[PDB]
Design a protein around this nucleic acid. Structure first.
Lengths: 95, 111, 140, 119, 82, 97, 83, 108, 96
DNA sequence: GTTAAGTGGTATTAACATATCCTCAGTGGTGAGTATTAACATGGAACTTACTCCAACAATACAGATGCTGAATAAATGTAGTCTAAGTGAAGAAAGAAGGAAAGGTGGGAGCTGCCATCACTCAGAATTGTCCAGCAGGGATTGTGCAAGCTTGTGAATAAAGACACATACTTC
DNA sequence: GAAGTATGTGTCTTTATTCACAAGCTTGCACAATCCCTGCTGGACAATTCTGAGTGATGGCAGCTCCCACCTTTCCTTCTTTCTTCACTTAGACTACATTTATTCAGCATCTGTATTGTTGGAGTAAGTTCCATGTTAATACTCACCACTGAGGATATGTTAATACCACTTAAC
């Protein structure tokens, strides 16, 4: 069979972090896979048109940050912005 | 005025009967705890195929395609009955009437 | 003689008609007042139906009740649509008046007016109360 | 050639930075994609996953279950004011509804007064 | 008479169960015919779009993704089917 | 003197305002409200003339459309008076509450 | 440097009554005006917050008509006539 | 060299096929754009434009006006069942509303 | 000189002069009509872009545009819009 | 001198304050009865874990497109003041709408019974979809050319604005 | 119910206002021609998955009977909202100037795409296992009709005493 990629192992990695002694059903993981795919298109779609509005050819972490501020509701937006900048800070400092 | 009657009554043996609303409230709790589909699968599957005949003939349906339609259909109807219930309570009733469905659908933007 | 038993039979039937007509004794007094002008208190009707009043009073109130029972049966709605005022004496006034006795049993009207103004009672009320004080003190 | 290190490990992320970069490049979003855009997006996606799974894992423990089912995802999302706004137009299959009966439908508690009586 | 029109397969007990999950305590007798008309309109919109995706793909079978895509196109995103 | 009945003039206002297209809120009081709200988001903010005008066209279109929904909720409850409970129901069914 | 406050009260009761007339309302409760002012404030806060977000992303300090138009479109409230 | 003929003239259109082609190419929609896609899209855009302008010019004539204003566009869109559905979530500036009064509000 | 800003103003005006030869249009209504064309352009092109992605296609063709038209325009609008779109492609193909 | 009225003196009488009692309403307490919840044992299917392998990711260099910083500056928004009339705010009188109470009736609920249509399962076939491979044409890239479209000016037709006249409707009177 | 009266909206005319339409200029982008190549198509073939049929078991549905709580109507009270008036307070307009900002170049920094290579993370498939659904049982909690208890207000019975009423004595008038 041809390979079909999904976020199943990454959602399971995150689940084993927050809740070590907890599993997830295959139907729930199908829902969690759809959630990550859906939010990905929402942020990437908003970031794509942010570049179009500003006549930019590149999608950067600033477009992603602005799309997160536009889409996520408040406390989610400021926590996700904190997480996103923390990872970009760690990524740049590393190499 | 003189508005009087005879309050005669009696009872020897009577099979237990619940008042009009005890079972209905029990059903609300039962079906809000559960997550299964409330429409029979075969009758719904026939309806989906009947509707699709208007658009294309000799159409085949995956099993999950009909299941995806049923999950969306009951979610739409359950959420509509939540808006319909609010309109009935707004009009100082507990019975949902067809005008409550029409008001709920009109405000949503479907009428 | 047999007037006793005839009154008793009339009173029993009177109780039956009053209970059948849905009228309270106070309502009976009100009806007697609005149909004759001599309104009677419900205590008199009680003592009647229980046959407590004296014989002369028994005969005196026989005719009024006869007329009321013979008349009220026709229509009640229109009927539905002069007490012997008897002022009470409060206990401190009673004590003060008793103090006014034991020294002058029969005061003059000149003193009676002063007594009335002192305790805020009507002159006729104080005069009749004085008379009845003398009366009950002369009983013994 | 140096030893390989995933861009997820550089950022300290469980989610794939290299795969998110590929999905951005072939998703027809912009002509170019920066190096920090997949890192930022993967970190945001991982945070949202942990937020839902934290609440859904709590729900599983209330029902004495050691495995998240779609019911717990629905309970987690609908009981969070902010996840419910993010997923307000989203239907979770086999999720059900929040148990909620309007207070006017509940039975009248025992009580009785007296109006004017003429009997 | 036995049920003839397919829409009639969405029985009154089935509609009552959907109202119970919606928190409805008392249901008028004219609700069921109204509810069947409401569902038929919803299904027509979704199925018309699901078939439109199918004929574009030059397929004869309606897949679960066509239903999911049709629902998303109407602002009714459904999770758990791909 | 001459007095109209309580509802004759109201119906007259309905006809004239549904026949016109002008903005029904005063421009300066609305512009000041716009600048006050924006202060919570960014200090020393400038606005184009058309940026405030676009906000007013959208704000009044939103409010007029909400009163139509609010009116239907009042008539549903067998009333002609719109009450705060009608705005709350209309906004809840729309999905804003 | 200027500061503003108490400007929702500048959305006067007669102005709210005109909006209800265009909405076809014949009779208005006395508590509608306070409810309407809160409704408008919530709506304006959401649109302006998105409009300023578009403005600060563009590295600008003036809010343009497009920022409002983009913000309104993001809420599903497309507005024709301003660009 | 041959004299240039615009792709609009080949398709018999008024809307620009060449410009619509460029907007499709530079809008980040797909890697490649076919030759008939701009022709099909410009024809659809031209039809939808003529649909509104036909109904708006009629509403302008019904008001004894020989010039379309935003009010006439609002009247055209809201009085057409299908155009009102296409533009259901769209606000037209300076268009007003339809003159609709509920029948229970009218005098006896 | 100000920078050039492209709009459908001259094309909306040309379409107007066929349906209503004697009727003009104000600049505010022209601005609304320009926003209508741009809004419908992003809807059809955006929907067609998703159709290519769903079917693993790298090209947007008149077939993707036709399916997008049927998905977005309602009822009688879609039937006439497909007719006009098909007629133009047929005429364009026969020319060159 | 006789007769009617006033004055007391004592007997009857009838209403007040409070003591009892009738009757009706509110609790509720209560067993039966039904349904939901919790404990506990068990099998299976659905999960997690451990192996191939292979396609996608990372490391490495480099070219070139993209974005940055500073300068100057024109464009644009803000700020303040002046004036006039359009709109707002407060008040007062009253119409009629909202809401409670009451009654009636009917429609929906709860429960019962019989049966048939749903469900779970199996199978057989054929219709459909997926894969692989060749290939070629449609689309991108490039360059040169010219002409369509945008911007800048300019003016006659469309629209707004009075202003008077003609209704059309509303509301009180007869 | 009409007549009459006052108010408002609409209609036709005249006149000034304004704003859209066309002419004139330049610039950038659309077309024509060319080459290159890869995405899309058509064919063949395996395989897979959906439709149609049959079957047995039983539970969910349909139809039914009560009957009662809910909806609807009617009537009445009240108090909220409307309509009108009048003083006054900002909004609108408009100048004028100050201040900020968005745009434009220019040079250079740097970041991303592209190509190539090597490996390793992730998907698929298989074994390993344990959580959960299902059952049975028991315990607990809820509902509902019956039995009863008792308190409240009105309505009767008492104790008791204001109030009148009947009678003997004296006193005033003709």
């Amino acid at each position: 069979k041809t390979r079909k990629e999904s976020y199943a192992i990454y959602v399971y990695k995150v689940l084993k972090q927050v809740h070590p002694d907890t599993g997830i059903s295959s139907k729930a993981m199908s829902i969690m896979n759809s959630f990550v795919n859906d939010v990905f298109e929402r942020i990437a779609g908003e970031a794509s048109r942010l570049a179009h509005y500003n006549k930019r050819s590149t999608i950067t972490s600033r477009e992603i940050q602005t799309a997160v501020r536009l889409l996520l509701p408040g406390e989610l937006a400021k926590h996700a912005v904190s997480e996103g900048t923390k990872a970009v800070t760690k990524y740049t400092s590393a190499k | 005025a003189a508005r009087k009657s005879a309050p005669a009554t009696g009872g020897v043996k009577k099979p237990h009967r619940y008042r009009p609303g005890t079972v209905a409230l029990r059903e609300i709790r039962r079906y809000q705890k559960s997550t299964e589909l409330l429409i029979r699968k075969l009758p719904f599957q026939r309806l989906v195929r009947e509707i699709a005949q208007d658009f294309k003939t000799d159409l085949r349906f995956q099993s999950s395609a009909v299941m995806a339609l049923q999950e969306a259909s009951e979610a739409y109807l359950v959420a509509l009955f939540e808006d319909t219930n609010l309109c009935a309570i707004h009009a100082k009733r507990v019975t949902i009437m067809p005008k409550d469905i029409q008001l709920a659908r009109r405000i949503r933007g479907e009428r | 003689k047999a007037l006793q038993k005839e009154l008793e039979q009339f009173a029993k039937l009177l109780k039956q008609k009053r209970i059948t007509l849905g009228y309270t004794q106070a309502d009976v007094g009100l009806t007697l007042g609005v149909l004759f002008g001599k309104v009677f208190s419900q205590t008199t009707i009680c003592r009647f139906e229980a046959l407590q009043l004296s014989f002369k009073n028994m005969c005196k109130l026989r005719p009024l009740l006869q007329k009321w029972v013979e008349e009220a049966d026709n229509n009640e709605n229109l009927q539905e649509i002069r007490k012997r005022k008897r002022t009470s004496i409060e206990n401190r006034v009673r004590g003060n008046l008793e103090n006014l006795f034991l020294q002058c049993p029969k005061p003059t009207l000149q003193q009676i007016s002063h007594i009335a103004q002192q305790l805020g009672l009507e002159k006729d009320v104080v005069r009749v109360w004085f008379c009845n004080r003398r009366q009950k003190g002369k009983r013994s | 050639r140096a030893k390989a290190k995933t861009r997820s490990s550089r950022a300290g992320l469980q989610f794939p930075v290299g795969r998110v970069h590929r999905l951005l490049r072939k998703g027809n979003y912009a002509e170019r994609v920066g190096a920090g855009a997949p890192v930022y997006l993967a970190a945001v996606l991982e945070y949202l996953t942990a937020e839902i799974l934290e609440l859904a894992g709590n729900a599983a423990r209330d029902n004495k279950k050691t495995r998240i089912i779609p019911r717990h995802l629905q309970l987690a999302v609908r009981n969070d004011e902010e996840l419910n706004k993010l997923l307000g137009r989203v239907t979770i299959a086999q999720g059900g509804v929040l148990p909620n009966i309007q207070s006017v439908l509940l039975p009248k508690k025992t009580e009785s007064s007296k109006s004017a009586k003429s009997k | 008479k036995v049920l003839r029109d397919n829409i009639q397969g969405i029985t009154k007990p089935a509609i009552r169960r959907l109202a119970r999950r919606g928190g409805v305590k008392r249901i008028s007798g004219l609700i069921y015919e109204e509810t069947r008309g409401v569902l038929k309109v919803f299904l027509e919109n979704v199925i018309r779009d699901a078939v439109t995706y199918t004929e574009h793909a030059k397929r004869k079978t309606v897949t679960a993704m066509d239903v999911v895509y049709a629902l998303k196109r109407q602002g009714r995103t459904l999770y758990g089917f791909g």
